[PDB]
């Protein structure tokens, strides 16, 4: 470090060689990296003393993947490992990508999404619909089976709420007035407020819906029920036919 004039360590917008707390923190991180490098680390330091350090050499020494290192270097905007600062930035990008089980290119794409107040200035950057779909696929590809199942359940609940609200707001049937989710439940004979955990079969839910419809019609809750039909033998014994 001293022979090179602290150009190896580098600095963030400051002349190199200064003695403050920030340079001490940088020195601590650099020493930790060198110690963790292992037996060939000394040689690597020599390659860092000159400017002959390459991405492939660093990837092989540290045990990472060449593609991951190259993508991180491209994303971070560094094209040469001149100083320790570039290595630190590359390693930070690699670590963040690994934390999300994804490659650094996806992290760069995620970061590039900015909210810049929707004009009144240069421009606002937002991906298109297809780009959003591709990004969602790439991000979701890193999940396990149980996490995928949990995500599917959450998506089902959110979609159910959104669809119920949209239908209540935009569509009205011919002669029925409905103003709430419970009205939708009573009309379509199927519960939309349930959680995703509970399971059932098609025949069971059809039976439940028809039973609910009969119970509503018999007790004169739904108007204009046919009086003559409601006196059949089957409905007269409804005290015993209402359960399987």
């Amino acid at each position: 470090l001293v022979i090179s004039g602290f150009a190896v360590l580098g600095a963030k917008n400051q002349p190199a060689g200064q003695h403050n707390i920030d340079t001490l923190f940088s020195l601590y991180r650099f020493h930790q990296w060198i110690n963790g490098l292992g037996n060939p680390g000394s040689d690597t330091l020599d390659m860092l003393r000159q400017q002959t350090l390459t991405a492939d050499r660093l990837a092989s020494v540290m045990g990472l993947d060449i593609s991951m290192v190259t993508q991180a270097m491209v994303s971070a905007g560094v094209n040469q490992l001149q100083c320790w600062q570039d290595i630190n930035t590359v390693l930070q990008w690699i670590d963040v990508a690994s934390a999300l089980h994804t490659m650094p290119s996806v992290i760069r794409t995620l970061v590039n999404i900015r909210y810049v107040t929707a004009l009144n200035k240069a421009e606002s950057n937002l991906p298109s619909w297809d780009e959003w779909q591709t990004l969602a696929e790439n991000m979701e590809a890193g999940l396990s089976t149980q996490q995928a199942q949990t995500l599917a359940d959450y998506t089902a609940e959110r979609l159910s709420s959104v669809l119920c609200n949209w239908f209540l707001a935009n569509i009205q049937p011919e002669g029925v007035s409905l103003h709430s989710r419970d009205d939708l439940y009573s009309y379509f004979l199927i519960d939309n407020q349930v959680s995703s955990a509970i399971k059932t079969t098609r025949l069971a839910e059809a039976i439940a819906g028809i039973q609910l419809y009969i119970n509503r019609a018999l007790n004169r809750i739904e108007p204009n029920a046919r009086a003559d039909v409601s006196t059949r033998q089957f409905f007269t014994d409804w005290t015993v036919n209402n359960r399987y």
């Binding site: 110690n35 963790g36 292992g38 680390g41 000394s42 020599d46």
Partner: protein
């Protein structure tokens, strides 16, 4: 789990200047230099 390792750097050696001619013959200078280097070796051992 962390680990640590030794680090080494390139190290150079001393050089030689042109010598000078004394007045005594060879054996006397040989014995004097022998005494001096013996003293130097003792110094090194003490330092270690």
């Amino acid at each position: 789990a962390l680990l640590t390792s030794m680090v080494q750097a390139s190290q150079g050696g001393s050089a030689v200047l042109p010598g000078t001619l004394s007045l005594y013959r060879f054996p006397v200078m040989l014995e004097r230099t022998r005494n001096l280097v013996a003293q130097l070796t003792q110094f090194g051992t003490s330092l270690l």
